[PDB]
Scaffold this active site. Structure first.
Site, PDB file in Angstrom:
ATOM      1  N   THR A   1      57.783 -51.842  66.032  1.00  0.00           N
ATOM      2  CA  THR A   1      57.474 -50.840  65.023  1.00  0.00           C
ATOM      3  C   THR A   1      58.661 -50.518  64.130  1.00  0.00           C
ATOM      4  O   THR A   1      58.547 -50.579  62.902  1.00  0.00           O
ATOM      5  CB  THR A   1      56.979 -49.553  65.696  1.00  0.00           C
TER       6      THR A   1
ATOM      7  N   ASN B   1      45.256 -44.179  74.201  1.00  0.00           N
ATOM      8  CA  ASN B   1      45.611 -43.000  74.979  1.00  0.00           C
ATOM      9  C   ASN B   1      44.653 -42.788  76.142  1.00  0.00           C
ATOM     10  O   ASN B   1      45.084 -42.493  77.263  1.00  0.00           O
ATOM     11  CB  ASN B   1      45.642 -41.770  74.076  1.00  0.00           C
TER      12      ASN B   1
ATOM     13  N   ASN C   1      53.803 -51.196  75.126  1.00  0.00           N
ATOM     14  CA  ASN C   1      52.659 -51.066  74.232  1.00  0.00           C
ATOM     15  C   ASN C   1      51.800 -52.321  74.234  1.00  0.00           C
ATOM     16  O   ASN C   1      50.570 -52.238  74.331  1.00  0.00           O
ATOM     17  CB  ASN C   1      53.133 -50.752  72.813  1.00  0.00           C
TER      18      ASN C   1
ATOM     19  N   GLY D   1      62.650 -41.871  68.147  1.00  0.00           N
ATOM     20  CA  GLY D   1      63.965 -41.312  67.888  1.00  0.00           C
ATOM     21  C   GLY D   1      64.094 -39.885  68.378  1.00  0.00           C
ATOM     22  O   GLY D   1      65.121 -39.496  68.939  1.00  0.00           O
TER      23      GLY D   1
ATOM     24  N   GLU E   1      54.908 -37.635  98.043  1.00  0.00           N
ATOM     25  CA  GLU E   1      55.017 -38.940  98.690  1.00  0.00           C
ATOM     26  C   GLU E   1      55.087 -40.067  97.664  1.00  0.00           C
ATOM     27  O   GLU E   1      54.375 -41.066  97.751  1.00  0.00           O
ATOM     28  CB  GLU E   1      53.850 -39.146  99.647  1.00  0.00           C
TER      29      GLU E   1
ATOM     30  N   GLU F   1      59.330 -32.293  64.403  1.00  0.00           N
ATOM     31  CA  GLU F   1      58.592 -32.421  63.163  1.00  0.00           C
ATOM     32  C   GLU F   1      57.308 -31.604  63.226  1.00  0.00           C
ATOM     33  O   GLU F   1      56.667 -31.522  64.278  1.00  0.00           O
ATOM     34  CB  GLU F   1      58.253 -33.885  62.865  1.00  0.00           C
TER      35      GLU F   1
ATOM     36  N   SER G   1      58.481 -41.129  74.625  1.00  0.00           N
ATOM     37  CA  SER G   1      58.514 -42.482  74.092  1.00  0.00           C
ATOM     38  C   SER G   1      59.964 -42.920  73.953  1.00  0.00           C
ATOM     39  O   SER G   1      60.735 -42.305  73.211  1.00  0.00           O
ATOM     40  CB  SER G   1      57.800 -42.554  72.744  1.00  0.00           C
TER      41      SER G   1
ATOM     42  N   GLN H   1      56.515 -37.614  69.412  1.00  0.00           N
ATOM     43  CA  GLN H   1      55.200 -37.868  68.843  1.00  0.00           C
ATOM     44  C   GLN H   1      54.327 -38.651  69.811  1.00  0.00           C
ATOM     45  O   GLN H   1      53.179 -38.279  70.073  1.00  0.00           O
ATOM     46  CB  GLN H   1      55.342 -38.620  67.519  1.00  0.00           C
TER      47      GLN H   1
HETATM   48  N1  GTP Z   1      51.221 -45.130  73.794  1.00  0.00           N
HETATM   49  C1  GTP Z   1      51.397 -44.750  72.533  1.00  0.00           C
HETATM   50  N2  GTP Z   1      52.636 -44.874  71.943  1.00  0.00           N
HETATM   51  C2  GTP Z   1      52.819 -44.487  70.664  1.00  0.00           C
HETATM   52  C3  GTP Z   1      51.767 -43.971  69.934  1.00  0.00           C
HETATM   53  N3  GTP Z   1      52.215 -43.669  68.703  1.00  0.00           N
HETATM   54  C4  GTP Z   1      53.524 -43.987  68.636  1.00  0.00           C
HETATM   55  N4  GTP Z   1      53.910 -44.502  69.840  1.00  0.00           N
HETATM   56  C5  GTP Z   1      55.260 -44.962  70.192  1.00  0.00           C
HETATM   57  O1  GTP Z   1      56.225 -44.214  69.482  1.00  0.00           O
HETATM   58  C6  GTP Z   1      57.292 -45.055  69.110  1.00  0.00           C
HETATM   59  C7  GTP Z   1      57.976 -44.527  67.861  1.00  0.00           C
HETATM   60  O2  GTP Z   1      58.074 -43.122  67.901  1.00  0.00           O
HETATM   61  P1  GTP Z   1      57.003 -42.246  67.081  1.00  0.00           P
HETATM   62  O3  GTP Z   1      55.654 -42.324  67.750  1.00  0.00           O
HETATM   63  O4  GTP Z   1      56.925 -42.722  65.650  1.00  0.00           O
HETATM   64  O5  GTP Z   1      57.536 -40.729  67.142  1.00  0.00           O
HETATM   65  P2  GTP Z   1      58.508 -40.243  68.320  1.00  0.00           P
HETATM   66  O6  GTP Z   1      58.307 -41.097  69.547  1.00  0.00           O
HETATM   67  O7  GTP Z   1      58.231 -38.792  68.615  1.00  0.00           O
HETATM   68  O8  GTP Z   1      59.993 -40.397  67.736  1.00  0.00           O
HETATM   69  P3  GTP Z   1      60.397 -39.671  66.366  1.00  0.00           P
HETATM   70  O9  GTP Z   1      60.143 -40.624  65.230  1.00  0.00           O
HETATM   71  O10 GTP Z   1      61.858 -39.313  66.414  1.00  0.00           O
HETATM   72  O11 GTP Z   1      59.551 -38.442  66.172  1.00  0.00           O
HETATM   73  C8  GTP Z   1      56.663 -46.417  68.886  1.00  0.00           C
HETATM   74  O12 GTP Z   1      57.533 -47.441  69.299  1.00  0.00           O
HETATM   75  C9  GTP Z   1      55.431 -46.406  69.760  1.00  0.00           C
HETATM   76  O13 GTP Z   1      55.637 -47.223  70.887  1.00  0.00           O
HETATM   77  C10 GTP Z   1      50.524 -43.841  70.514  1.00  0.00           C
HETATM   78  O14 GTP Z   1      49.594 -43.379  69.863  1.00  0.00           O
HETATM   79  N5  GTP Z   1      50.339 -44.232  71.818  1.00  0.00           N
HETATM   80 MG    MG Z   2      59.688 -38.923  64.435  1.00  0.00          MG
END
Ligand code: GTP
Ligand code: MG
Ligand code: GDP
Ligand code: GDP
Lengths: 48, 71, 439, 430, 100, 430
Positions: free
Chosen positions: C179, C228, C206, C144, C254, C71, C140, C11
């Site tokens: 989070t 973003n 973050n 998860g 490089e 998802e 990320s 995500q």
């Molecule tokens: N830089 C940035 N990080 C984000 C953003 N939204 C979520 N995150 C990061 O995503 C982490 C948690 O994962 P999710 O964004 O909920 O979703 P995911 O990374 O795809 O993991 P899943 O829950 O398994 O789908 C958080 O700890 C955030 O640091 C965002 O809009 N910008």
């Molecule tokens: Mg998720």
């Protein structure tokens, strides 16, 4: 070759129209979510 | 089978076209229509989509209209 | 003949893909429907679009973007979003079930059923390309879903492309602004995976990006949308040298041959400057001299690690705008003079400098104030040990009581996986301190 | 996609059904006739999560209504939104319950279970990818507990991976709704602990307590109490249905809220709530939102939440909001109340964002957390259970339908055991 | 989104800004009269109305592309006659200021 | 071409007849006078199947009616659509059978074969390329099983290369109509196994079971029970009379459903059927067709199709639909229920598609299956027979008209053996 399915699987024994004593019951911890125990620790390699 | 065209696009040049061919100084292998041909090819096909996308829509519509008609 | 492929898994990346790519298209002006109204361009000829797009035969211009997610909710939104006409229909891949913040589910439950296409999808895209410069992996760490597939993605890449260099951008958990409640676990394993399979990496914690907003842009209620764009701007600067004409261009290649003392310790952090909203742009000179120094300020760094606690091993900076070559040299000259920044004993020169002419474009309705100055910062320093330390400091604490362990147990992973995670994490930090000791 | 089905049992179980589908029906914009007059596609982007499709566009609830006595089931039909359910999903017996677990779990409910299992099996296989179940049954009733719990027990056996959501109503001693309630309660938990994954205990006292000190209203019926809970249910299921910053389904909620395999009893609440004469001065901001969410009095369980130590909890905000003002608030609460949170799990509160606030408002919150304060409920039930058993009074009935004594002794030990473990973590230190 | 209350106003509140902000950013040949002049082409019967396909089509040519949801709110507010038709004249009458 | 001729026996045989012709007449568009008023060319394309042309435009059914008492042929020709049966073929004696399997099969039936045998031969001589015969006869009725079996015994004697089909109505155990039902039950069966190519079992107990639970109509009638059955027989051969994707002639049905020579009994049913209150709220898609087809309560037989395993089954899709789901959906049923299907007959379901749907609907399907459960029916009939024979009860009525009790003993051995033999493969494994 194996095609080992994970979470859900699709093979069953009593799927759709399966079903055709008060003495029996669950004794202490036959339930899945209980049993606050963990399996044994194995070394594992990770070398690959 | 036969072989009528030297190239699938360009037909054989008119016999008067080869006024020379005395030496290997002209080859007609340089195209001079390549860049132009590609760009024109774009639109010619695109209409084909334009025709088709509509057709698939109406075919679906006839499918959809009947369902309600049954409804 | 130069092109790149970007992988966005999870995500966090997904919301990054829209942000990262939106800047690029406007950069060329590529029309949202994919059929650019066409122009003669202003820099590096009309071929610049090649890197991020390929001719469509007729009409649009499809980005080389491949999206994987377990998802549907976040992904499909792109399928009906304003950019419905941009991405090819069968390259935005989404699954059925959610990971539920479990790595074992992400690394040992639904891999084969869905990981297979990713190689299938990527391979088809690559075959069209001829002189591929490299790949970019965005995920990320605390997510998860991404950690499993990505690591699943990363591991498979090592055998798929081998010598094909791989470059990645991750997002570690924030030290106090958190989070989830199980983020450390999958993070520790996730980093455990990527220690041995990525040439160059970057950290984008973050919180650090959170702070700069209040100090510089003067906004009190930001949301992930604001974050973003900043991430997008840095990426554009890094890849600018590929297509836009410059006196001394710097290709992506490089980076795995200039920014790593050893193949092992390759975790390097980036910065940004200048970052000034036009609210206050009426006062700051926005000159090269001040901007360059700001690149070394402690507060503006993209991660919440204080550079003053460690040395500088390698730092890559590439410029963009109307800077003059003479000024830049003066910019470096002053920095080395400062005692506040001390470099290692065995690194005589710790700077590869890049320069670019084209001014960065402005995202519609964004908070950035377009300037004629910009510096992209990439540094790999001994200070990065602590960030792992805090993650390790958490990981040990929970394990003492074996909390939340079974649910990972029931996904097929063994219990001993943790031991090598701590040791592999532990096996590292001792390395960073050692190289930092002067001979 | 990842849709769920609902089954409810008992008058309390049934009654919630009439309201539960009422609020869910309106959220996506379903009318009493059921035809779709929805305004925005945001109401249909994930409509199948709770509805099927048939001819004419009429959308039918994924409902399964089952009971021992028809009278309560009869009433649910004639009210508003009483026309959505289809007859085939309905089932009813002929002898009744009599608030006796025996007649609900061994002899009477045994004969009728075949139909429900058949009807439950019809819906699940048809659905695209079943995601889980939500059981709303009453522990204080004979048919409720007996048929209810046995329904939870059987289902798990055939399905390996399905997740479960269980909303119960534990009886509080003050409102003695059934003298046989103490015995029934202990029996229900014993069966529940072994198969139920997630259970949210809501004390009727809070519903009554809520109705007076939170809403400040004069004369509420069980509809309002039925109204209050219904919001909570939709509070948790929404994120799986609508676009959001960080999508999170029910299972994603479980992984972050059950620290150990069988410490899985949670605590839920609603906010913001204000009265007719007091809802004009306050300022509607999340910083004011969080304040009412943690306050003990508003929590919907008679177990005082300040007498225990929180282990795990989750926050599910509703409506638009920036990441900052929610996350920074959450970080603020964790540090400023250190003594109230365990020490061997840091950053132990989860947060998420949903992009569609409830209709008619601007911001709302739904909270679910695992707190040791729940130990107050079982012991007090535990003490009451032993009191009635030392004289064997009322014990004869359960023995009148094939049951036997050692079942009760076994159940009592486990519940005494379950309380035993849930507190050893309270004094545990790192 | 959440277009039950002031939503009808609020949801259209943003969309104007994007159209207002988007046109200014490019700062080129964009004549706010181009949309007014383009619309008559699809009018056909000059009744001042267009079905949803056209209006979405009309927006496509100019260079303003929006979400599916955002358009959906468009029809509801400007469907004055509850025929499901947007009065482009009304739309063009809007998104046009009174001048400084 | 390849048409067939029908022979109906006994009162139960005649009444059941009174309907299918009516329904059969309905599909082809044949008015009571015999004057054709169909709408398309299709209805007349294969009219030879069940009619021969007669000068004057009205069509002659190839029907032969047999019954020992004149009443049945009396009423059948008095009500609606009774004038299509043409008077020449009517055959009736003067006596009647009185439920005496002896009376209708040796005493009176033996005396009458002459005329009826003569007429049937001629009609078979009429057809261009004969296909087979269909029969309606009542096992619990003395005359039906008596006169019916002899002809069936006689018919196979001269047409060695024609497939034979027999719909049978065996008496259910719950509600009985005749006390001599047990005796005549076995004797007809014993002779049925040795001569019939295909015999279908329909239990009157199920029909009323089908009517109350599915049709939900207040007041059924034998006309309704006739209605249900009459549809099925049209179901088996429908695809043959109309152009279609995969033509499946009745013989092809024999190919794919008879595992071994002696197991030639199947169970059938018709669906879908809707209620007076559910016809508008169900679903009309392929999954519904498959979901109800295998449902226990729809099979016209008293034997539950889950007490055993299906040796083989066939589904004849009627009407237009995407074949994708026809084949795939079967693959859905086969996999999830392997334990209920023997493991040495892979891909043990037959499928067919016909392009002409029933009048008034879009989708339709008829089901025919040979299941191990049928052992339940013969045992109870077998068990009952032993109960009355040990005491020689009612033995004299059959002993005093030419018979010996040795034949009765002989009949049991074969019937018992088939029951034993039919169940041998259930415990067999590969
Ligand atoms: N830089 C940035 N990080 C984000 C953003 N939204 C979520 N995150 C990061 O995503 C982490 C948690 O994962 P999710 O964004 O909920 O979703 P995911 O990374 O795809 O993991 P899943 O829950 O398994 O789908 C958080 O700890 C955030 O640091 C965002 O809009 N910008
Ligand atoms: Mg998720
Ligand atoms: N809050 C609330 N509780 C209810 C409602 N209906 C029933 N109950 C609970 O159900 C308990 C009585 O159980 P009972 O009606 O016998 O359940 P049944 O036998 O399954 O119908 C009481 O303690 C109530 O608290 C309702 O509408 N609201
Ligand atoms: N379902 C149904 N069963 C019938 C019908 N007519 C006869 N039967 C069955 O046939 C049995 C009686 O057969 P009977 O009339 O004595 O046969 P007969 O010797 O030819 O007169 C009853 O037990 C019924 O079950 C009918 O119209 N519908």
């Amino acid at each position: 070759f194996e095609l080992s399915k994970g979470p859900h699987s699709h093979k069953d024994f009593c799927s759709t129209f399966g079903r055709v004593s008060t003495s029996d019951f669950r004794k202490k911890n036959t339930g899945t979510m209980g049993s606050n125990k963990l399996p044994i620790i194995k070394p594992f390699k990770y070398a690959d | 089978m036969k072989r009528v065209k030297e190239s699938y696009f360009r037909e054989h040049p008119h016999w008067s076209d080869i006024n020379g061919c005395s030496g290997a100084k002209e080859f007609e292998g340089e195209d001079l229509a390549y860049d132009a041909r590609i760009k024109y090819q774009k639109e010619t096909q695109k209409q084909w989509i334009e025709q088709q996308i509509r057709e698939k829509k109406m075919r679906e519509e006839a499918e959809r209209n009947e369902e309600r008609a049954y409804a | 003949m130069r092109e790149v492929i970007s992988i966005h898994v999870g995500q966090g990346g997904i919301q990054v893909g829209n942000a990262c790519w939106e800047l690029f298209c406007l950069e060329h002006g590529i029309q949202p429907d994919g059929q650019m109204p066409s122009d003669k361009t202003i820099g590096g000829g009309d071929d610049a679009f090649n890197t991020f797009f390929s001719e469509t035969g007729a009409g649009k211009h499809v980005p080389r973007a491949v999206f994987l997610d377990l998802e549907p909710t976040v992904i499909d939104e792109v399928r009906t979003g304003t950019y419905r006409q941009l991405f090819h229909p069968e390259q935005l891949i989404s699954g059925k079930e959610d990971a539920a913040n479990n790595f074992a589910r992400g690394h040992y439950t639904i891999g084969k059923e869905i990981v297979d296409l990713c190689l299938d999808r990527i391979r088809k895209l690559a075959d069209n390309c001829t002189g591929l410069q490299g790949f970019l992996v965005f995920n990320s760490v605390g997510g998860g879903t991404g950690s499993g597939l990505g690591s699943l993605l990363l591991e498979r890449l090592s055998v798929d492309y081998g010598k094909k260099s791989k470059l990645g951008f991750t997002i570690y958990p924030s030290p106090q602004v958190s989070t989830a409640v199980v983020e450390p676990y999958n993070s520790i394993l996730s980093t455990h995976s990527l220690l041995e399979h990525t040439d160059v990496a970057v950290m984008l914690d973050n919180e650090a990006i959170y702070d700069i907003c209040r100090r510089n842009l003067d906004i009190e209620r930001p949301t992930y949308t604001n974050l973003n764009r900043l991430i997008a701007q840095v990426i554009s600067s890094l890849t600018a040298s590929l297509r836009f004409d410059g006196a001394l261009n710097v290709d992506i290649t490089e980076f795995q041959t200039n920014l790593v003392p050893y193949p092992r310790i390759h975790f390097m952090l980036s910065s940004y400057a200048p970052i000034i909203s036009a609210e206050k742009a009426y006062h700051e000179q926005l000159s090269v001299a001040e901007i360059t120094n700001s690149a070394f300020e402690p507060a503006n760094m993209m991660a919440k690690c204080d550079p003053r606690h460690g040395k500088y091993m390698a730092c890559s900076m590439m410029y963009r705008g109307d800077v003059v070559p003479k000024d830049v040299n003066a910019s470096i000259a002053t920095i080395k003079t400062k005692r506040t920044i001390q470099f290692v004993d065995w690194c005589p020169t710790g700077f590869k400098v890049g320069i670019n002419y084209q001014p960065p474009t402005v995202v519609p309705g964004g908070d950035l104030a377009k300037v004629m100055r910009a510096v992209c910062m990439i540094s790999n320093s001994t200070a990065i040990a602590e960030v792992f330390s805090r993650l390790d400091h958490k990981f040990d604490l929970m394990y003492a009581k074996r909390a939340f362990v079974h649910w990972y147990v029931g996904e097929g992973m063994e219990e001993g996986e943790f031991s090598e995670a701590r040791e592999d994490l532990a096996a590292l930090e001792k390395d960073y301190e050692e190289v930092g000791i002067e001979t | 996609m990842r849709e769920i089905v609902h089954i409810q049992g008992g008058q309390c179980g049934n009654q919630i059904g009439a309201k539960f589908w009422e609020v869910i029906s309106d959220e996506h914009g379903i009318d009493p006739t059921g035809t779709y007059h929805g305004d925005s596609d945001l109401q249909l982007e994930r409509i199948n999560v709770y509805y099927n499709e048939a001819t004419g566009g009429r959308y039918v609830p994924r409902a399964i209504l089952m009971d021992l006595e028809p009278g309560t089931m009869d009433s649910v039909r004639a009210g508003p939104f009483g026309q959505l359910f289809r007859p085939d999903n309905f089932v009813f017996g002929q002898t009744g319950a009599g608030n006796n677990w025996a007649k609900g779990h061994y002899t009477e409910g045994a004969e009728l279970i075949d139909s429900v299992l058949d009807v439950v099996r019809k819906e699940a296989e048809g659905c695209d990818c079943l995601q889980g179940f939500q059981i709303t049954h009453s522990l204080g009733g004979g048919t409720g507990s007996g048929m209810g719990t046995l329904l939870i027990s059987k289902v798990r056996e055939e399905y390996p991976d399905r997740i479960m959501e269980t909303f119960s109503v534990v009886p509080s001693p003050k409102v003695s709704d059934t003298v046989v309630e103490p015995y029934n309660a202990t029996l229900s938990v014993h069966q529940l602990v072994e198969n139920a994954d997630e259970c949210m205990v809501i004390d009727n006292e809070a519903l009554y307590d809520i109705c007076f000190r939170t809403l400040k209203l004069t004369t509420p019926t069980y509809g309002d109490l039925n109204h209050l809970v219904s919001a909570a249910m939709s509070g948790v299921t929404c994120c799986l249905r609508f676009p959001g910053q960080l999508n999170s389904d029910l299972r994603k909620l479980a992984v972050n809220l059950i620290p150990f395999p069988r410490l899985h009893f949670f605590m839920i609440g609603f906010a913001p709530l204000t009265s007719r004469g007091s809802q004009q001065y306050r300022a509607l901001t999340v910083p004011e939102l969080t304040q009412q969410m943690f306050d003990a009095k508003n929590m919907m369980c008679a177990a005082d939440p300040r007498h225990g130590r929180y282990l795990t909890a989750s926050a599910l905000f509703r409506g638009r909001m920036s990441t900052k003002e929610v996350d920074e608030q959450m970080l603020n609460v964790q540090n400023k109340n250190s003594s109230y949170f365990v020490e061997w799990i840091p950053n132990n509160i989860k947060s998420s964002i949903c992009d569609i606030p409830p209709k008619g408002l601007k911001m709302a919150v739904t909270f679910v957390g695992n707190s040791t304060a729940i130990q107050e409920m079982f012991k007090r039930v535990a003490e009451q259970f032993t009191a009635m058993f030392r004289r064997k009074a009322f014990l004869h009935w359960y023995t009148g339908e094939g049951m036997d004594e050692m079942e009760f002794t076994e159940a009592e030990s486990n519940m005494n055991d379950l309380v035993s473990e849930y507190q050893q973590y309270q004094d545990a230190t790192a | 989104m959440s277009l039950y209350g002031v939503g009808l106003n609020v949801q259209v509140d943003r969309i104007k800004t994007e159209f207002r902000l988007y046109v200014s950013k490019q700062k080129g040949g964009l004549n706010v009269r181009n949309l007014r002049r383009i619309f008559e082409q699809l009018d056909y019967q000059q009744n001042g109305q267009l079905n949803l396909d056209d209006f979405k089509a009309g927006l496509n040519k100019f260079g303003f592309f929006l979400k599916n949801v955002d358009y959906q709110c468009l029809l509801k507010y400007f469907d004055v006659e509850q025929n499901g038709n947007v009065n482009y004249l009304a739309f063009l009458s809007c998104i046009s200021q009174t001048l400084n």
